[PDB]
Amino acid sequence: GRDHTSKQHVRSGHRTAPKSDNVYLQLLVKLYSFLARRTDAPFNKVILKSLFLSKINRPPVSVSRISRALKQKGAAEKTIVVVGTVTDDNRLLEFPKATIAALRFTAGAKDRILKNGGEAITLDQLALRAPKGQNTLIVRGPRNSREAVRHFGFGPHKGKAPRILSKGRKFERARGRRRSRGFKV
């Protein structure tokens, strides 16, 4: 017998492969499994891990986030890397000339990027023009802006959103939300 100081036979708790059965995503995982196994560049290990992530863990990246990341000091000619979808933002007044590598582009995002003199390339084209991820800049979308996160950790004095189907004066606004109706939490 052994006096176990930890739980036995515990899986790592991290994805070692995409849940997706897309063969082309599997080819991308192949390419970056080789790069991460053989290049010593930390970029390739980060990209390989990000290719496993689920859809909510790869939030869409607006073309405004890319504009703001390119507005960092000394980052105007970096290659923007988004492991996910790049969406359009019709609130931009202007977009620069940039090189962006992404899993997917929307029609508006790709149209704007090419309209302004830039490139919209895939991660395999990235692996050839930057096999060690030189002069790159990974951009991630907001994870906590999702609607489901509004209701996480609901409780008294927690300030989160109740799980409710209708909105109005008759739906969960009286007792416990108001001192005129008892208490407020």
* Options 1, 13, 74, 156; binder of other proteins; rule CB under 8 A: 156
- Which of RNA, other proteins, none has residue 170 at its interface (CB below 5 to 8 Å by kind)? other proteins
- Which CB sits closer to other proteins, 17 or 174? 174
100 labeled part of a ligand binding site: no
117 binds other proteins (CB under 8 A): no
Nearest to 142 by CA among 65, 67, 45, 43: 65
Footprint on residues 73-112 left by RNA (CB under 7 A): 73-75, 78, 84-85, 87-93, 104, 106-109
Phi, psi of 86 (to 5 degrees): -100, 120
119 binds RNA (CB under 7 A): no
Block residue for tokens 């108001």:
178
Residues in CB range of 32: below 8 A, 6 or more apart? 44, 47, 48, 51, 123, 127
Angular region, 133: left φ>0, alpha ψ -120 to 50, beta rest: left
Q: Binding-site residues, please? A: 113
**Applying CB under 8 A, which residues contact other proteins?**
90-91, 93, 151, 154-156, 162-165, 169-170, 172-178, 181-182, 185
